[PDB]
Amino acid sequence: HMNPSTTQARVVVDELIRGGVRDVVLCPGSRNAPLAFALQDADRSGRIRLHVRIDERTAGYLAIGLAIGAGAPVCVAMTSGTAVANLGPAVVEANYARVPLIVLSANRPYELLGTGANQTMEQLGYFGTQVRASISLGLAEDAPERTSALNATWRSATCRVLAAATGARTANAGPVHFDIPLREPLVPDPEPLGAVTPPGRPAGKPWTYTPPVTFDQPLDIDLSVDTVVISGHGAGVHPNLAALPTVAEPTAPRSGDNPLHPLALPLLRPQQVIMLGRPTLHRPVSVLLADAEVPVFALTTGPRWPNVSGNSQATGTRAVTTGAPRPAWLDRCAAMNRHAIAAVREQLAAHPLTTGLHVAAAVSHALRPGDQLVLGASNPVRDVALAGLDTRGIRVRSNRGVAGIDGTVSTAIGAALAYEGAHERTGSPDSPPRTIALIGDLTFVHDSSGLLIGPTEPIPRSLTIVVSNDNGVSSRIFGTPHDVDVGALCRAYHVESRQIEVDELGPTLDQPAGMRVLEVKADRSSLRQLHAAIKAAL
Amino acid sequence: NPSTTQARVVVDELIRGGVRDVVLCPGSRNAPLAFALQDADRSGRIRLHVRIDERTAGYLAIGLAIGAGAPVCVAMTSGTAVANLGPAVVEANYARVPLIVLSANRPYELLGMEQLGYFGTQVRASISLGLAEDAPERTSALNATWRSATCRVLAAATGARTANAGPVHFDIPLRVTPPGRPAGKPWTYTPPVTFDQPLDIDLSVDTVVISGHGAGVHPNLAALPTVAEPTAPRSGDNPLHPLALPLLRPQQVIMLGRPTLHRPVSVLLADAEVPVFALTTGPRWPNVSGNSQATGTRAVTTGAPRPAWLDRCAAMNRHAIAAVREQLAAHPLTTGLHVAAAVSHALRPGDQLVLGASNPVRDVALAGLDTRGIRVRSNRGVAGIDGTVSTAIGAALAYEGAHERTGSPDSPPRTIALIGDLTFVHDSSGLLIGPTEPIPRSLTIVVSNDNGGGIFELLEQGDPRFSDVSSRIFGTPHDVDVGALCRAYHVESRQIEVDELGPTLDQPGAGMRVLEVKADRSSLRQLHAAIKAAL
Amino acid sequence: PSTTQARVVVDELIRGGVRDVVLCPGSRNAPLAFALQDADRSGRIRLHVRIDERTAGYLAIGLAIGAGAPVCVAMTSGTAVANLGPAVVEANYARVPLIVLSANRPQLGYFGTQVRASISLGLAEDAPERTSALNATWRSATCRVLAAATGARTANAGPVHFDIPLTPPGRPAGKPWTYTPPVTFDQPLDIDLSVDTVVISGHGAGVHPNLAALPTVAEPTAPRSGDNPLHPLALPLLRPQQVIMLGRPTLHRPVSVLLADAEVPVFALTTGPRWPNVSGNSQATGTRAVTTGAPRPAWLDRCAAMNRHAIAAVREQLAAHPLTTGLHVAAAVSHALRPGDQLVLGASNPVRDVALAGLDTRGIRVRSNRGVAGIDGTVSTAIGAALAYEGAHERTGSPDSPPRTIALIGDLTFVHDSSGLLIGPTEPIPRSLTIVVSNDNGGGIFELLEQGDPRFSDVSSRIFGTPHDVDVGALCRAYHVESRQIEVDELGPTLDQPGAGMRVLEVKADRSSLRQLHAAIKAAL
Amino acid sequence: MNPSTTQARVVVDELIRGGVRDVVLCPGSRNAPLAFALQDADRSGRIRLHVRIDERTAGYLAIGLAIGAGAPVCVAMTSGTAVANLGPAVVEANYARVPLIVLSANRPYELLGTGANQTMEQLGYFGTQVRASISLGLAEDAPERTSALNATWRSATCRVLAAATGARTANA
Numbered sequence A: 001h002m003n004p005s006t007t008q009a010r011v012v013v014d015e016l017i018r019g020g021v022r023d024v025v026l027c028p029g030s031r032n033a034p035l036a037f038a039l040q041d042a043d044r045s046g047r048i049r050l051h052v053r054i055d056e057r058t059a060g061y062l063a064i065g066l067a068i069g070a071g072a073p074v075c076v077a078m079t080s081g082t083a084v085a086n087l088g089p090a091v092v093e094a095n096y097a098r099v100p101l102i103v104l105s106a107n108r109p110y111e112l113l114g115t116g117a118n119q120t121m122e123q124l125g126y127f128g129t130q131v132r133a134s135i136s137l138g139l140a141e142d143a144p145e146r147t148s149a150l151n152a153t154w155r156s157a158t159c160r161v162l163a164a165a166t167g168a169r170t171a172n173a174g175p176v177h178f179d180i181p182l183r184e185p186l187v188p189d190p191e192p193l194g195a196v197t198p199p200g201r202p203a204g205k206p207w208t209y210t211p212p213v214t215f216d217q218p219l220d221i222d223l224s225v226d227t228v229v230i231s232g233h234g235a236g237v238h239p240n241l242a243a244l245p246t247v248a249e250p251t252a253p254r255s256g257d258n259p260l261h262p263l264a265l266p267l268l269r270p271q272q273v274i275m276l277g278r279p280t281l282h283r284p285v286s287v288l289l290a291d292a293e294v295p296v297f298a299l300t301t302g303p304r305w306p307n308v309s310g311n312s313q314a315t316g317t318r319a320v321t322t323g324a325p326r327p328a329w330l331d332r333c334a335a336m337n338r339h340a341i342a343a344v345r346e347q348l349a350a351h352p353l354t355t356g357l358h359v360a361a362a363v364s365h366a367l368r369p370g371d372q373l374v375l376g377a378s379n380p381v382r383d384v385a386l387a388g389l390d391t392r393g394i395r396v397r398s399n400r401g402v403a404g405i406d407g408t409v410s411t412a413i414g415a416a417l418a419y420e421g422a423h424e425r426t427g428s429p430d431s432p433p434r435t436i437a438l439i440g441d442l443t444f445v446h447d448s449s450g451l452l453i454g455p456t457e458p459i460p461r462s463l464t465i466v467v468s469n470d471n472g473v474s475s476r477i478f479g480t481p482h483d484v485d486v487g488a489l490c491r492a493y494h495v496e497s498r499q500i501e502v503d504e505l506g507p508t509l510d511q512p513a514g515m516r517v518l519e520v521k522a523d524r525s526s527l528r529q530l531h532a533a534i535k536a537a538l
Numbered sequence B: 001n002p003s004t005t006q007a008r009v010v011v012d013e014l015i016r017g018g019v020r021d022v023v024l025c026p027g028s029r030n031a032p033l034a035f036a037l038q039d040a041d042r043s044g045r046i047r048l049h050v051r052i053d054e055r056t057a058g059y060l061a062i063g064l065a066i067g068a069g070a071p072v073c074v075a076m077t078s079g080t081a082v083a084n085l086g087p088a089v090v091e092a093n094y095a096r097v098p099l100i101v102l103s104a105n106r107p108y109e110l111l112g113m114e115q116l117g118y119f120g121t122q123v124r125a126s127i128s129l130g131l132a133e134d135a136p137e138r139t140s141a142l143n144a145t146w147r148s149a150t151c152r153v154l155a156a157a158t159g160a161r162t163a164n165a166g167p168v169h170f171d172i173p174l175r176v177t178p179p180g181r182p183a184g185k186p187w188t189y190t191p192p193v194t195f196d197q198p199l200d201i202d203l204s205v206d207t208v209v210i211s212g213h214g215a216g217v218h219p220n221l222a223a224l225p226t227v228a229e230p231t232a233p234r235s236g237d238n239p240l241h242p243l244a245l246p247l248l249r250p251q252q253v254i255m256l257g258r259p260t261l262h263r264p265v266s267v268l269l270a271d272a273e274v275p276v277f278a279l280t281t282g283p284r285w286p287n288v289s290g291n292s293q294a295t296g297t298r299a300v301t302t303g304a305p306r307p308a309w310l311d312r313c314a315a316m317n318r319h320a321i322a323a324v325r326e327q328l329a330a331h332p333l334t335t336g337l338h339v340a341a342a343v344s345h346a347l348r349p350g351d352q353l354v355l356g357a358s359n360p361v362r363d364v365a366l367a368g369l370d371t372r373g374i375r376v377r378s379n380r381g382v383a384g385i386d387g388t389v390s391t392a393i394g395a396a397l398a399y400e401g402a403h404e405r406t407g408s409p410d411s412p413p414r415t416i417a418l419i420g421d422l423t424f425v426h427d428s429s430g431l432l433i434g435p436t437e438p439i440p441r442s443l444t445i446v447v448s449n450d451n452g453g454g455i456f457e458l459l460e461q462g463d464p465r466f467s468d469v470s471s472r473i474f475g476t477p478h479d480v481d482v483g484a485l486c487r488a489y490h491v492e493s494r495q496i497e498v499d500e501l502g503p504t505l506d507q508p509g510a511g512m513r514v515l516e517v518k519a520d521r522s523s524l525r526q527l528h529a530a531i532k533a534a535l
Numbered sequence C: 001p002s003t004t005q006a007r008v009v010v011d012e013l014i015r016g017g018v019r020d021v022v023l024c025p026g027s028r029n030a031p032l033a034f035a036l037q038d039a040d041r042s043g044r045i046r047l048h049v050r051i052d053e054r055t056a057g058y059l060a061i062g063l064a065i066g067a068g069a070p071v072c073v074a075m076t077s078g079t080a081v082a083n084l085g086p087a088v089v090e091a092n093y094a095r096v097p098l099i100v101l102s103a104n105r106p107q108l109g110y111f112g113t114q115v116r117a118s119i120s121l122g123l124a125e126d127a128p129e130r131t132s133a134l135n136a137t138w139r140s141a142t143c144r145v146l147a148a149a150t151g152a153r154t155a156n157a158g159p160v161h162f163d164i165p166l167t168p169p170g171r172p173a174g175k176p177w178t179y180t181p182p183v184t185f186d187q188p189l190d191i192d193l194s195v196d197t198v199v200i201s202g203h204g205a206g207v208h209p210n211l212a213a214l215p216t217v218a219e220p221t222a223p224r225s226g227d228n229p230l231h232p233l234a235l236p237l238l239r240p241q242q243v244i245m246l247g248r249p250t251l252h253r254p255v256s257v258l259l260a261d262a263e264v265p266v267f268a269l270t271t272g273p274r275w276p277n278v279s280g281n282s283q284a285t286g287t288r289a290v291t292t293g294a295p296r297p298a299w300l301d302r303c304a305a306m307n308r309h310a311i312a313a314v315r316e317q318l319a320a321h322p323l324t325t326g327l328h329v330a331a332a333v334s335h336a337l338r339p340g341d342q343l344v345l346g347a348s349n350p351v352r353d354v355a356l357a358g359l360d361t362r363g364i365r366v367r368s369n370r371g372v373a374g375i376d377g378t379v380s381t382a383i384g385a386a387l388a389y390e391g392a393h394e395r396t397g398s399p400d401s402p403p404r405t406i407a408l409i410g411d412l413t414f415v416h417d418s419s420g421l422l423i424g425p426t427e428p429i430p431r432s433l434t435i436v437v438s439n440d441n442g443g444g445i446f447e448l449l450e451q452g453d454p455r456f457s458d459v460s461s462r463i464f465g466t467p468h469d470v471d472v473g474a475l476c477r478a479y480h481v482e483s484r485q486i487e488v489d490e491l492g493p494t495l496d497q498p499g500a501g502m503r504v505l506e507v508k509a510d511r512s513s514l515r516q517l518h519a520a521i522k523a524a525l
Numbered sequence D: 001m002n003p004s005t006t007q008a009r010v011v012v013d014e015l016i017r018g019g020v021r022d023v024v025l026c027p028g029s030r031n032a033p034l035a036f037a038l039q040d041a042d043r044s045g046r047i048r049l050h051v052r053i054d055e056r057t058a059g060y061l062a063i064g065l066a067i068g069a070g071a072p073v074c075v076a077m078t079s080g081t082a083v084a085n086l087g088p089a090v091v092e093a094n095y096a097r098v099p100l101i102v103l104s105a106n107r108p109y110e111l112l113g114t115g116a117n118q119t120m121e122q123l124g125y126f127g128t129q130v131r132a133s134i135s136l137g138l139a140e141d142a143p144e145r146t147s148a149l150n151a152t153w154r155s156a157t158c159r160v161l162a163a164a165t166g167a168r169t170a171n172a
């Protein structure tokens, strides 16, 4: 015989594994001990990798990283009370970035809500419309005669949680709140007088199998009309559009070989626009989408479609193309793209001081096919886009959902861990692929506690964090530098760090060292002149 | 620009309502009342605090409000502000902290702020002002409407009518200053209500008082044996050690406030043979077991405790105190209980004490802290380990500000925080205060560092049969260099031994310093079992 | 400024397929009511005014399920949100495109859980230097509302809250501002038909040609996929090894017992992203089946034998029973239907008894509020269903009278929504709607439940039966509606007789013998 | 003794001790345990039962029963739109401060989302219009804990009554 809380936790953990969950983030507590015990045992048998963290807020962004690194649903488990509320920021990010994040909260029994019990709040529903679903398991009953029926109901609810999070039937992945009320006894009973977990379906199959869904919405587009493609976060790959001039955000997957620099778009006159994904980065892009005279055709992978344009003529998922672009239009767009690249290149060289744009250019040139790049959503993504990075053959991650500074370090760490984990499944005996992160100093200092990894927890094998330190009424905290020593922060969290120059950045990134932080000074003073010089050069 | 005029009307009425501190974070949107708050800051009518981390900003506001009992405003500015403020707002609801959350929505924008679901369940009120309309003739009527909504917001936050203080959402939408009542009086005067529910209690029945967070002060119960949590204001001279409770058989329990500590208390409160009388200061009342027989706000007492009962309680109290003292001395390694004892013996009348969750708030009550003359703060609302550093900082700032505004030439009184290492790791970023922002002048954070969560060694998951599995999932060692952490944030820090803790606290240092004491948690369970065996 | 914002929104809703709007008088939504009034006088939209806001919601449900079109309801009061609650819940669960229009001059929890979207336009600012950008913003948002309501991109139609807080053209050729092709939601399931399989199809099911040969228990609202029906009462006489469940089945305890059987795998095929699993035995979900094998001939033989046995045991035990019951009235209405008719069923016994009588749904359109299975709103639902259905036949222009809409409801249901018969003289009235009322003076379904056991005979009269003694005939005449008390035998001929646009036919029925009649049918199987 | 019946009999008894003299009942299958326990209390003269068919009109009947003499009044109904029909009466009871206890039966909460018949998001439907939204635990079959389940059930009933009558908030 097994106590009810232990049985329920072992069933849930088993069904989550069968649904593709490979990594679980756990935060310590007493009320979530049943989940903790069952997760620890699955990690001892090698069925999942467990990542323990102390701060639930940054642990939520770690889980986002573990999910975007390879595309698998990731659970984060914590105790009752403000621990659940600390997942707020990650849940908002995962909502707008469509990240399959399962928030697995332990709770007191609902009967205690309103009694004044310790560490108990209104947990179910806390996340509102940010989550794709708020699902509660029932309090586990002590009914050995009903063991088979309770197993079917727990595994079915778990599959609903997994389906809603991965978007298996909605094509709209996102975060899910899975709340589990738990009561004493919370620790497993003596194992000699123990029992076996109620089994699932045979052959490691999910309890409710849901096969791959196809969400199809064709759209007719005449490509002979002068067309530009603008691809943002969450865009899909469209091979029938690969020839068109394309302004692509760094995180957007590239369809073709005809890039168009974002600075070139204002100097051209497209007659119609194809919007892929959710573009938000570039401001001239936003200017063109506000232009009411230019028809916009939106192509999304899911049912959500962006509000970035008011003259959206149609929304679909793929294009049924008629015609071909004027060769003179392709020539003009290619000509302007080269002009914009040269203008950026020349003005960086003419600039004396090293700026953040220089570091971004230096990181972009040091990337090799197969690398993963993680970018802070402030200046790093804009700077890499102005530098003209070729994203083909590399995977680029960034928290573009709400583009916050919270959790950027933890996201890079998680993405590096999932990326390296997927490289072992291929059975290859090579070295793990590189993960390079480029983040600002203010972002790094704000999520420096994301560097904290207990001595027994997984550490990324090939992660390098490049910190572009530019030392910068509510804006009066930027009137002075924050003055924090990046080296001191790294020592506090036992992390190797080096201060280097932009010339050294390339050759130092090629040195094969676990996790490390590479700090590069830059100047914010001259940035306004450099950007003004680039615009005058066009 | 009427929107600018509106902001000065609200800020002025907020200052008339008792607001002395506002917390801001930079964000995409202009802050609600940002420039009116800036004008008020330079003129000395209000004090601004700016932070980058919105989570630590919320908990700083909680500290500013519990340090002296004043309402405090927090100014949201971004699309992450609601999610990051959630923890502080939840804690303000359960600890009854007057917290005003200022927001600035756009009614000309299309909808359908990144709102979650907690605003509905956590706040006392949700008041919007309405768009500032241009009308030079209705300026005296608009002034009255804006100042009435502001007085209503402060009343809901402080519980002026409900006796249930808590957080309030105040929205001021955006697309000289008109005057208020004379002598700086608020627009709408509401006397702080008196909430009265007298209850009959016979004190001849063997009775114990158990007072928790939010407990009132009761002079007619002063003689009874009393198990008081650290945050409860004391009203008697007859304290009863929490470890003495299971050595007695009370026939009656008076519960003051909301108790959350000591499983011996929970066992006694759940015993259906022992009537429990709940005396609370607000409308809510605790009933975790279902054994709360009656509720009230004050006791109408008949009789007095039997002299033999008081003698029995005092004898068991002396056995409990001796067991804790003798077993602490006979134990080689320093634990958090040793650290808590040293801090307790170092406090002086007038000190403010801030206690983190986990073992520190329990250990101080096991050491027998005398709380009279002392101000004790702790986030017992939801017992989170998040935001405790910023709560201490805010509590010190508000506490020092009240002493400064009495004009006493003496140095500001001390605020001493006692927190675990995970608690410090959780909110270490709360230490980053820009040179422009107010910094405490007498805040000392004592960090009892046992490299993980020591309380789990004392629970069921700390039983030796889990010794192979409980290190990763409960102990959670981190190996953080605390001194290196405080250096990066430019905060004075010193690692010392428990016997040096007393003298180091007695002398002053920088306005803000962190004292770290290395402690052991591998002997923690053995030390507590030996204390129980010596009772 | 707000006057042109209302006119553009109304124009885009009409371009989006809205043909009917329900409005309740009140001191609000004045500009939108004007724009709607203008379009009603222009012939672009049909306006329906009601006084009861709860009946107005269920009327809009009917106008939507009658021809599958989006329908709007305009709130104008500080009680409308509470009164539209029941209809919004029904629209959520039955996936009905209901657009609820508000106009907050600057609060229950159901809006957060029940609706597909909550969109507010924003205030109508006064800047004629940007009137072409406000035009697109208003027609884009309105296209989002229409798309969320009809499931254009989600394949999950439902209610939408559209708030316009208190004339420039659209696309040429009357097209919607943002075109969205109806989406294809596909998810194939591998099913082996050589296993002994029964199909159980409920509310919201699709049509599956590769399943037309399998024995099929179909709820009346389910569109039949083939021509091998299996009577529900035959199910406990069979031992299927596999169940294909279409849509959302909600009727028949044998069906419920079978789906709960953990030995029998269940394969759920749904037209949308939601799927049922009350038991936890759902082995897989999908939208269509990829089939191998073929059903065993012995299995088909057994099923067809139980089917005829169940049909015969019902048709004969109805003859022996002398008293007229609700099961007889359902049988009578079922044989009085011809292809092209629309049949509206109330919940409780009427929708179950029609299934026991063996109605052949082919050629008939069957409506019923199975989403939450409420006895409220059925009268106004049938009126709206008739109006929408007759409006579609009128737009084709056939040289034939409007097709018939027959409603079969219980007594309690008729008095629960009696105020749905209060239709003002200026208001559109059905032209071929006949409401048949089976009246056994109480709730006859409770006689078939555990509280209907003879050991609760002296306690179950008050709390389950609830006689009302209401004179149905007088209630209809008070509302200026034709009524006639007929017997079960004259039901058919009276129904065949073309009559007034609205007729209520009352048939007396017995419920004291209902538990005996269902036990006699059970023993004859 | 089956737990639903014991649970329903404890709640009804404690409601009566709290001053409830009138209860409005609407017919349904899911609220059978409350219906039986209420009928038993009407036969004994402890309360006066009132049966109605329409839940919307039943809520205004309970409001009348409350303002007639100033006592808390209950309205019990089944799951589904039966609760949604109490919407208009709850709104009126909120603004007029009438102690109206909406006593709703429900399918088990684990059935929410499974497509079960007559199951909706009931808990929280009324939102900000109620003084409190309290659920009892699903009655467990466990004779060892009957005394603990009694205290838990009666304490919750008292919280319902105090919030409805404003016993400690002065805001019925």
Ligand SMILES: Cc1ncc(C[n+]2csc(CCOP(=O)(O)OP(=O)(O)O)c2C)c(N)n1
Pocket: A028, A029, A030, A056, A079, A081, A082, A083, B336, B356, B357, B358, B359, B360, B383, B384, B385, B386, B419, B420, B421, B422, B423, B424, B448, B450, B452, B453, B454, B455, B456
């Ligand atoms: C926000 C939050 N997360 C998690 C918990 C669970 N919890 C309770 S005590 C504790 C350990 C705290 O350790 P520390 O601060 O080092 O104190 P110690 O008990 O070792 O003195 C934890 C994680 C909590 N109460 N709040």
Ligand SMILES: Cc1ncc(C[n+]2csc(CCOP(=O)(O)OP(=O)(O)O)c2C)c(N)n1
Pocket: C326, C347, C348, C349, C350, C373, C374, C375, C376, C409, C410, C411, C412, C413, C414, C440, C442, C443, C444, C445, C446, D027, D028, D029, D055, D078, D080, D081, D082
């Ligand atoms: C709004 C609502 N309230 C209550 C119920 C519960 N219920 C189900 S069947 C029924 C009785 C309906 O009786 P009637 O319409 O006369 O039908 P009969 O079963 O006698 O044919 C009731 C009250 C419901 N489904 N909907």
Ligand SMILES: O=C(O)c1cc(O)c2ccccc2c1O
Pocket: A114, A115, A116, A117, B093, B094, B095, B096, B213, B214, B215, B257, B258, B280, B281, B282, B284, B285, B286, B287
């Ligand atoms: O007395 C208090 O301070 C207090 C505070 C609270 O937040 C409570 C919450 C639930 C139940 C009782 C509570 C209570 O008695």
Ligand SMILES: O=C(O)c1cc(O)c2ccccc2c1O
Pocket: C092, C093, C094, C095, C203, C204, C205, C247, C248, C270, C271, C272, C274, C275, C276, C277, D113, D114, D115, D116
């Ligand atoms: O297929 C349908 O029509 C349908 C409709 C619904 O409203 C559902 C609600 C919950 C669960 C399943 C559902 C479902 O399968």
Ligand SMILES: [Cl-]
Pocket: A184, A185, A186, A187, B460
């Ligand atoms: Cl335990």
Ligand SMILES: [Cl-]
Pocket: A375, A376, A377, A378, A379, A380, A408, A438, A439, A440, A443
């Ligand atoms: Cl950054």
Ligand SMILES: [Cl-]
Pocket: B357, B358, B383
């Ligand atoms: Cl604690």
Ligand SMILES: [Mg+2]
Pocket: B420, B421, B422, B448, B449, B450, B451, B452, B453, B454
């Ligand atoms: Mg510790």
Ligand SMILES: [Mg+2]
Pocket: C410, C411, C412, C438, C439, C440, C441, C442, C443, C444
């Ligand atoms: Mg009837």
